[PDB]
């Protein structure tokens, strides 16, 4: 060990700059003479990972790791390994390697800052505080160190220490602040105010001191919105009402279009009990802002007189109908969610009286806007023929509006006509090809109309077309979600339709002379193969949204240092909250539920087709053999044609690169080994570790914990659901019946778990569900359910129909009851349930 270290030191400068081939050549020349060099292998792994290679880089890194016994080597190798782990989404190993390097003897304090970022990604703040303290004591000439120390002491719990540190820093640097460093300083001041907020509590002297400090720093703080908000909060936490009212009036003068400021002023003034005071206040404020909308929308929520309410509604709808806004119904969208038989008749009467005095030629714009508003109002009131008549009259009057076509497509979708709606919306979109919202709506409605190829062809227009025949790669690079969700649902519907198709084809079973279904089977086989391939592609596309969220969370590497260098601690806390709440999105929950349903269906049908029927030799023959008719050449030609078609299909639906993911066909995802383990270690642990209290889907947790052998979690979730959302829901009774049928000794599980669940049920719910009817086969649970919770619930009936194999409570009677109970709903939902859910 003499010349190899010199060559490594002379080649390290190539990696330090912007050189890769010259360093790789030197590493190869070194390894050609001695292959047992750990530093050279560790550098070559990172060099191959930084240029594009993945397999060779991982192999070299694994070899370098295996060629290490103790923790006593050069710190450069450990630093390179830490960089590699940081670049390969490995935080624990990177932290361990950096700690081992710093424990050996490194004179580079900046490495400590790296740890201050790494642990900042895993939440380990106990050692992060010490790392920040060391990195601050190492260099005393940058405000980023002070900001990082303040943030670390505020997040942990050292509030007084952070206040003292900020005070000492401001005393030492009083007057030595440049111009560009003023704003940041102001931001820091605001952050200190936030710290003082944590020292506010309910003490009078503390709040007075915070108010005095805020009034003293007001001439120095540049941010005025947050300053005035904190001032109003302090005034509300004390007792001064006039000063708080003045602050809120100043905020309104700064920005009148804000419902939050108006609500806070209403709460501060204490006039929420009397209606005349609020009426006079809003009538006086209307003269100050005649062009706003909250001052005219909020007073429509506490009116009791019918004549006054009608007059206010008329004065609110007259300017909107005169100027013509594409959101008039939106302006009354939330009110319709809270009022109905009391407000909607008066609004309809006013609109009819206004329309009876208009003219289709003198005032065409108010005429068409009144027609659109009437169509919206009737569509909201479950009316369809009159809405279609109004939209047809509007199209005949002025066929140059996209909103009319959008409303027609929405009505046709609500009436179960998806294809006609897609056709009308495409025809309307072809009128002007410059808007993207209408294109996205058309693609979504085509995906909802069992039309995927045309939807993709329409979407492949505004996308960047380079190394692909369509724009699927561009749609995946712009970070999409709704498109994938809407396309996977169409794939699932098309796959479920094939089940009914095969059932109808097998119901004949070659009845008498039925050679038509026997002589024609190649097309059916090709259609089934295509449907299976698209179903696999759907499962492949499902593995994207969680991966996208993981990539978004991992891309916060340089942000931990940027938020401290630029001086944005409040933005850092906001980013932390955003990263913690990432797993609380509705689209994420929907995608996770769909993935769970798919995995459970795959587990079920795999365990069903594993050991069933008989004669495997007569079933594993398939085709590719016509006896004495050249079977080898025929099978070879068939395989060649299938491969040639699959290559073109994969190039058409190309989304992921070939060097990044080889599972393009998706055959390995639909035939995995442990689906439940993968779903728990990839899709469930994150949602379990990052979740609130009231926002928690108990149905998905119950479905996940049912088929694993753990019933205590099921009982806890059921108890929490009954305590939160009450006990008068059909879902509670359905889950209780499912649990009672699962605790039967006939089902192969754990007798101890069944016994403890039975004891818990007998101890908790003793006068709700008969727990002594598990031995009688004549007791019908459907009658008891419809007597207690009733048959009007749809979610409970859907859950009982989904879990009917393990709970024998009938089938035909349940289906008839569901059909009879679905009638007071919308036709499209009824059709979808009868076609797929039933």
């Amino acid at each position: 060990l003499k010349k190899e270290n010199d060559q490594f030191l002379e080649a390290l400068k190539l990696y330090e700059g912007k050189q890769y081939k010259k360093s790789l050549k030197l590493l190869d020349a070194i390894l050609k003479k001695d292959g047992s060099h750990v530093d050279s292998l560790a550098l070559k792994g990172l060099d191959l990972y930084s240029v594009g290679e993945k397999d060779d880089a991982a192999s070299y890194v694994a070899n370098a790791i295996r060629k290490i016994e103790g923790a006593s080597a050069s710190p450069i190798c450990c630093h390179v390994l830490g960089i590699y782990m940081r670049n390969t989404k490995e935080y624990k190993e990177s932290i361990k390697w950096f700690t081992a390097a710093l424990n050996n003897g490194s004179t580079n304090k900046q490495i400590y800052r790296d740890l201050a970022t790494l642990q900042s990604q895993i939440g380990d703040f106990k050692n992060a505080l010490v790392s920040r303290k060391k990195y601050w004591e190492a260099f005393l000439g940058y405000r980023a160190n002070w900001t990082s120390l303040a943030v670390a002491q505020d997040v942990n719990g050292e509030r007084q220490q952070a206040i003292n540190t900020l005070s000492q820093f401001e005393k030492l640097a009083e007057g030595k602040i440049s111009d560009s460093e003023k704003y940041e300083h102001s931001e820091c001041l605001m952050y200190k105010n936030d710290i003082m907020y944590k020292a506010a509590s309910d003490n009078q002297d503390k709040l007075q001191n915070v108010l005095k400090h805020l009034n003293d720093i007001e001439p120095c703080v540049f941010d005025k919105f947050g300053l005035l908000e904190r001032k109003a909060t302090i005034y509300m936490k004390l007792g001064q009402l006039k000063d708080a009212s003045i602050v809120y009036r100043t905020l309104i003068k700064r920005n009148p279009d804000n419902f939050k400021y108006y609500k806070l002023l209403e709460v501060s003034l204490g006039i929420q009990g009397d209606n005349k005071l609020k009426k006079a206040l809003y009538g006086k404020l209307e003269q100050f802002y005649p062009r706003c909308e909250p001052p005219k929308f909020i007073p429509l929520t506490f009116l009791q007189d019918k004549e006054e309410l009608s007059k206010k509604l008329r004065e609110y709808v007259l300017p909107q109908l005169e100027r013509g806004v594409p959101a008039t119904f939106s302006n009354v969208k939330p009110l319709y969610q809270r009022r109905k038989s009391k407000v909607s008749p008066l609004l309809e009467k006013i609109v009819l009286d206004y329309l009876s005095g208009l003219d289709p030629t003198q005032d065409p714009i108010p005429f068409i806007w009144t027609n659109y508003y009437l169509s919206q109002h009737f569509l909201f009131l479950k009316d369809f023929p009159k809405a279609q008549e109004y939209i047809d009259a509007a199209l005949d009057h002025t066929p140059t509006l996209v909103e009319f076509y959008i409303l027609k497509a929405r009505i046709l979708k609500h009436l179960g006509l998806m294809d006609t709606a897609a056709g009308i919306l495409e025809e309307g979109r072809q009128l002007d090809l410059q808007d993207r919202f209408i294109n996205c709506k058309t693609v979504k409605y085509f995906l909802r109309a069992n039309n995927i190829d045309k939807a993709v062809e329409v979407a492949s227009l505004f996308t960047k077309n380079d190394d692909s025949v369509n724009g699927i790669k561009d749609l995946h690079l712009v970070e999409a979600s709704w498109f994938i969700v809407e396309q996977a649902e169409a794939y699932y519907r098309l796959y479920l339709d094939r089940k009914k198709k095969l059932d109808d084809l097998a119901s004949l079973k070659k009845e008498v002379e039925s050679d038509k279904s026997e002589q024609i089977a190649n097309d059916i086989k090709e259609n089934q193969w295509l449907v299976r391939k698209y179903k696999g592609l759907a499962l492949k596309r499902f593995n994207a949204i969680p991966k996208f969220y993981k990539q978004f969370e991992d891309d916060q590497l340089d942000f931990h240092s940027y938020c401290m260098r630029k001086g944005t601690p409040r933005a850092y806390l906001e980013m932390l909250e955003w990263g913690k709440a990432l797993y609380t999105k509705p689209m994420y929950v929907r995608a996770m539920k769909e993935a769970s349903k798919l995995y459970f269906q795959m587990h079920d049908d795999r365990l069903k087709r594993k050991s069933d029927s008989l004669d495997e030799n007569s079933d594993e023959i398939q085709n590719n053999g016509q006896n004495s008719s050249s079977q080898k050449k025929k099978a070879k030609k068939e395989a060649a044609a299938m491969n040639k078609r699959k290559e073109t299909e994969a190039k058409s639906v190309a989304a992921y690169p070939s060097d990044q993911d080889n599972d393009v066909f998706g055959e390995k995802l639909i035939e995995t080994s442990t689906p439940m383990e993968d779903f728990a270690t990839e899709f469930y642990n994150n949602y379990s570790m990052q979740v609130r209290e009231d926002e928690r889907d108990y149905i998905l947790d119950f479905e996940f914990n049912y088929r694993i052998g753990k019933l205590a979690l099921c009982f806890a979730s059921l108890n929490k659901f009954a305590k939160r959302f009450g006990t008068t829901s059909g879902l509670f009774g359905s889950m209780a019946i499912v649990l009672l049928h699962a605790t039967r000794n006939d089902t192969p599980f754990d007798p101890i778990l069944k016994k403890v669940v039975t004891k818990s049920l007998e101890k908790e719910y003793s006068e709700n569900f008969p727990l002594n009817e598990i031995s009688n086969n004549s007791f019908d649970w459907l009658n008891f359910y419809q007597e207690k919770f009733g048959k009007n619930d749809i979610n409970g009936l859907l859950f009982l129909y989904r879990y009917r194999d393990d709970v024998p409570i009938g089938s035909s009677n349940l289906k008839e009851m569901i059909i009879s109970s679905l009638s007071p709903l919308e036709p499209h939902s009824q059709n979808e349930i009868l076609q797929y859910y039933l």
Partner: protein, 235 residues
């Protein structure tokens, strides 16, 4: 309705969805994260608001109302909709504004740069983008002390032209040939910003006849007079 507020990070993903329904030139998550964590006192958002309106009561009471499943029973969750932000709140538009930070070897003073302004086409023609731009310019002038503002506009989009050149009254600076991905020419506009002209209180009225009475907000006024229950001016 329309509610203007500051662009929070907890919704930027949904904001990106709005981009998918607006300008074709999309951006990655890093772009939006940088522009939302670098200067948060510039970019604003416009969403909806749903509050109470006579709960239960007695005058034509009905417990079978909608209210996004929040009245009686029907659980209490959020509707499956990527455009929603809260049970009764959805985003209708936003405006992203950045500051000059790249080196130019010329000592450029801190100026305003309007990055993007995207509002849903179905929710326009009622004062949204104009208010967002006014609030952004006022916040920049009050906090960052922006000397001027510079932005870009297209050509076929007559709405943006009427909003910037006509409504906001901006001055055209130069013409950039082939700037976007489609190879369409753009107009780079620039206007010197001031402090005594971008006040919101000076733009409370849309149009006027000739000589009206522009009333603003002075000191106290709402806590004066007497109780509106038995006075002279009590209805």
């Amino acid at each position: 309705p329309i509610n203007i507020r500051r662009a929070t990070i907890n919704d930027i993903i949904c904001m990106q969805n709005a981009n998918l329904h607006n300008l074709p030139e999309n951006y990655m998550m890093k772009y939006y994260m940088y522009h939302i964590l670098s200067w948060p006192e510039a970019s604003f958002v416009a969403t909806t608001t749903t509050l109470d309106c006579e709960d239960s009561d007695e005058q034509d009471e009905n417990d079978k109302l909608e209210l996004t499943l929040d009245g009686t029973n029907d659980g209490r969750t959020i509707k499956l909709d990527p455009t929603y932000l809260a049970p009764g709140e959805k985003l209708v538009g936003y405006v992203l504004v950045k500051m000059n930070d790249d080196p130019d070897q010329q000592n450029e003073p801190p100026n305003g740069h309007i990055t993007s302004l995207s509002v849903m086409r179905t929710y326009r023609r009622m004062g949204i983008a104009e208010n967002l731009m006014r609030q952004a310019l006022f916040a920049l002038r009050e906090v960052h002390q922006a000397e001027y503002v510079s932005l870009h506009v297209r050509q076929s989009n007559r709405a943006a032209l009427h909003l910037y050149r006509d409504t906001l009254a901006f001055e055209v600076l130069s013409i950039e040939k082939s700037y976007y991905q489609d190879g369409e020419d753009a107009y780079a506009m620039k206007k010197v910003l001031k402090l005594e002209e971008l006040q919101i209180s000076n733009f409370t009225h849309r149009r006027l006849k000739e000589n009206e009475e522009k009333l603003e907000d002075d000191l106290e006024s709402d806590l004066l007079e007497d109780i509106i229950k038995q006075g002279v001016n009590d209805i």
